[PDB]
Amino acid sequence: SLQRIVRVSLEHPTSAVCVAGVETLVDIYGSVPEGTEMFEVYGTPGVDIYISPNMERGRERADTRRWRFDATLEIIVVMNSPSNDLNDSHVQISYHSSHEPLPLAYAVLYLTCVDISLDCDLNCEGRQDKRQWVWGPSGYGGILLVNCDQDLEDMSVMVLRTQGPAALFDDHKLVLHTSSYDAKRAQVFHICEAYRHVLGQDKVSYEVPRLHGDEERFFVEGLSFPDAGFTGLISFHVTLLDDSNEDFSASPIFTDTVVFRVAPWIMTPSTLPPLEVYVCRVRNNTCFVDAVAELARKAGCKLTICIQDEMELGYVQAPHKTLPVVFDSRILGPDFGYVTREPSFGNLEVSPPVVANGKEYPLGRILIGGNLPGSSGRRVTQVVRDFLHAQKVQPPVELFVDWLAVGHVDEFLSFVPAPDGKGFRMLLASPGACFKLFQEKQKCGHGRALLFQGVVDDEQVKTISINQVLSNKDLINYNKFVQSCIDWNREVLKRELGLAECDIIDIPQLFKTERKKATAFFPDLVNMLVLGKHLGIPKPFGPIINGCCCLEEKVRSLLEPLGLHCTFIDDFTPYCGTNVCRKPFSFKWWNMVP
Amino acid sequence: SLQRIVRVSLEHPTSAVCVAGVETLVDIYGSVPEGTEMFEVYGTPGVDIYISPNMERGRERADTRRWRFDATLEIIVVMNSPSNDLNDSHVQISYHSSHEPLPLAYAVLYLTCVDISLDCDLNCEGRQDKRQWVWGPSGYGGILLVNCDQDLEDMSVMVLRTQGPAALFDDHKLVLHTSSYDAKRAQVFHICEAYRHVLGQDKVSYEVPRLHGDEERFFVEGLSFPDAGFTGLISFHVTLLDDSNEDFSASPIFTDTVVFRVAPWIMTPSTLPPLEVYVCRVRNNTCFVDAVAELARKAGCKLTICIQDEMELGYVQAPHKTLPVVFDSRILGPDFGYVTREPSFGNLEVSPPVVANGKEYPLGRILIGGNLPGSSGRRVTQVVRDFLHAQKVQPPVELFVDWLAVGHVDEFLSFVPAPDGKGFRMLLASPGACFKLFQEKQKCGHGRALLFQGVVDDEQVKTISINQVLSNKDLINYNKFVQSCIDWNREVLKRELGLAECDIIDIPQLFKTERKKATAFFPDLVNMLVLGKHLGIPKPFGPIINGCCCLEEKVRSLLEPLGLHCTFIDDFTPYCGTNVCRKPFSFKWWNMVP
């Protein structure tokens, strides 16, 4: 870089304000004396004086010798140290002729150095520039955590450094201002019950008292997540204004900016480590809550309370803290946030970190269960997907779920830790894996094995044999249909998540029809609970061969090789929902480069 | 890239639809015969059959020999040519054992190839990819021209290519769909009084009749420019849906997309060639309209009509046509468009093509006359700047105009053609250039020269001499103030427009005070009309030395060297506005890479 032109007169002295480190360039207002041929420049000790050709970029110290007068030359004055008193430094230019021993004329410029800096804390990824927000491993910006759609220890502090003569500000004003747009989505408090609401919704500008010496503290709070019309960027400026020309108008001296970005909302994948599990109270299903308790104690801690698929759990994060957030449509509350968008799929849908089509998704991708084109009803896209695309960090992919009676993505999809490959496996429900399994068992002579023999060990509940299933032509054809439905999604996922067949495990799962749409013929295996290396799998109640549920043995043969532990939980045995909280990524969202 | 999984059965044949060029991959539903060791694949002539390892990327033709059975292998079937009739082609897989001479079992898949393509016209900059919108010299997208905030020859045509058996579409449906968001800002007509409004504001989906044979034409019209909440992108999709499983649900086969971008609004710089000039009728100022007519005939054509600064003139452009557009707050109309944003500076403000801070601005930058921080009033930023930033193509810079009574950017700023350097010069009003000039004339003995001697040659209107001006201390100090005001803007422009001093010309201009704010002491020279190499300059009525307005002679000495022709027009002599239309850039906006 920033430069500034201050113009001096031969007739009388000039008075000016230097901002610490900014280059003031000094020109003359009007003409230079008669017969001028040379000039000298001189300054008090703290004033750095340079010359430069106005074409070339370099600078040279000027106070040491006498220069041939060239209009093309530039005088540049900088002051790095604030002034103690007004006009305690000065610059003198003298013009000279070879004939006349003495200066033709003097031009004197008294200066007052003030240091003004508006600042936050960004990051040291590529420390050192402009006031904008740089994504990436070599970028920088301020972060704002949004709490809601003491009061805030999760607040973002803003500091104004003002060093210089006190009296300077009898005459000069410090404005803190923002945009109307930026004001609607953020608010600032000045420290200065004690914290005073200076910049806010109607409030756009604010004269700074300078009630607290050298530095003036502020606390910023972001009120809105990035929406369809909001990029998540908030700028604040400070401006030094000159209001000494009582007859003239007020004029700007200097401006500084700080740019904040609102932290996006990030979904947690069922491959992240678990922290706490939300289970909704069941007077009826004691044993199931016991089993989930045992699982949690197998992995971590588990809280229970009087739905789960009604809301989603994610997090926001800044360098200082990460904050759990809940997306909805009343709360836990302590150490929690809330996001609500009002205009109902709501279910759990996010992938692990992946690489696809050259692009890289370090935080994974959000899987939105779509609604088939040309359909009267809308299922998930209730243009909150607005909000999810606006997050920018987990680009979503649409999936095909219209064929299910319920229509949840987790009904046929699961992501599980893997010790090799890409570190995870994708589990897909597969009627056809079950078909193959039943045929293999049939050819071994176990065609008479009875599904639902554990369920109907004591309460007769319509058992079926492998043979009866395999020869029910209608059931087989319907399951071929839903297998093809799942195939479509499989190929979509394989594309958008750059997955290979070797990364995918087909889980034997049958289906039947409720109102011409898919439901689970036997408990949906893939509707897992994934807590690190421990799995809460709906016990299938499949055919008992040699006193074992061959379905369970299959799932084990598939998953135990990967170090997983399969605990088959009795979800369907007795005639609310399930959800969990997870620790964030090791990866930091601001290091992504969309 | 796209792939698709079609599953076949040993029990009975399978029927499927191939989209032309898409890879169908063929697997078996359930298990493979007993003792299977080998397999062969075969197809009718138009069916290309390949094998691939599911790990590796290559493909190999498969119909020529007998393969060792490996579950890891992939069968891939493609059909590049549409089918004449249903199921007129097929694929047969046979499984084999070394012991048994004959195929253990067959799996047969009858196919119907249909070619479905949704298409527009993008560009041949880097022809050849994905359906998205690529900026740059090696990019592509569809363009939509917005006419308003026969019916349209400036319409964007959309084509659906459907080749294949007619009967196929008794059973299968073609949906044309868009987003609700995209629907609000665009509408489509199907040809198909004759053109039928199929996709529109409430309309999101549309079954395609196929009333017109192989290809179905559509005409798209963009209704909204890119705003704060609109990026200018509009996507349309076609989807082939299978609705033959009357008992099951409908399922997707294939989807295609075409992406349009709304063309931004581009301001025309006063260095572009002129086309037509808008002059508002003046019963009083005959001679001035005569003079502007003479200027236009010096350069081009000029129309006159019964303000100019009330609106702005720009253009939108697509590969087929460019359309003049007028931004407002009734019209010319034929070959014209209109943009209006409702919630008043309105004046003329745009720079020429420039390079700054590494970034490149091929179409120039928009100069927004800002309002000083913390001021009750808003002058230009009435959050239509929303709209101007949203255009994305001419990033705007804020300037300081609060010191003027009127406050127009053109009051002190002008861009003029230059034959060298950067091809243009920036002209700035400069009290100080005038100061220097008056001093030089004073030292030559012409201190008695009378300003306003032409104006007051016959009507005595308070003439001033050079000497009287120079010694009016108050006037000089005020003009030093406004010179510093202009200095600030000069440095801003020099930064944001990467300009050098050698690119700037200071034009001698004095000022006086109207209600503590700047107005022209003598007619504002820099408030030019720039028509190619011809200039309509307010005649200054400056001091007559040797029967010449020394101000005019100065302006000539500055501008004539650059090939310019200065015609001093009598704007202020007798006791509405001015505007012009310009030919677009040679540069094309879609070749910029913001």
From Swiss-Prot, chains A, B:
Keywords: Calcium, Cytoplasm, Disease variant, Hydrolase. It is found in: Cytoplasm. The gene is PADI3. Its cofactor is Ca(2+). Changing residue 543 to T: In UHS1; forms large aggregates; decreases protein-arginine deiminase activity. It comes from Homo sapiens (Human). Catalyzes the deimination of arginine residues of proteins. GO terms for molecular function: calcium ion binding; identical protein binding; protein-arginine deiminase activity. Hair follicles, and epidermis at very low levels. One of its GO terms (cellular component) is intracellular membrane-bounded organelle. Belongs to the protein arginine deiminase family. Coiled coil: none annotated. It catalyses: L-arginyl-[protein] + H2O = L-citrullyl-[protein] + NH4(+). Its EC number is 3.5.3.15. It comes from the Eukaryota. This is Protein-arginine deiminase type-3. It is linked to Uncombable hair syndrome 1: A form of uncombable hair syndrome, a condition characterized by scalp hair that is impossible to comb due to the haphazard arrangement of the hair bundles. A characteristic morphologic feature is a triangular to reniform to heart shape on cross-sections, and a groove, canal or flattening along the entire length of the hair. Most individuals are affected early in childhood and the hair takes on a spun-glass appearance with the hair becoming dry, curly, glossy, lighter in color, and progressively uncombable. InterPro entries: Cupredoxin, PAD, PAD_C, PAD_central_sf, PAD_N, PAD_N_sf, Prot_Arg_deaminase_cen_dom. Its main location: cytoplasm. Gene3D superfamilies: L-arginine/glycine Amidinotransferase, Chain A, Protein-arginine deiminase, central domain, Protein-arginine deiminase, N-terminal domain. Changing residue 111 to H: In UHS1; forms large aggregates; decreases protein-arginine deiminase activity. Signal peptide: none annotated.
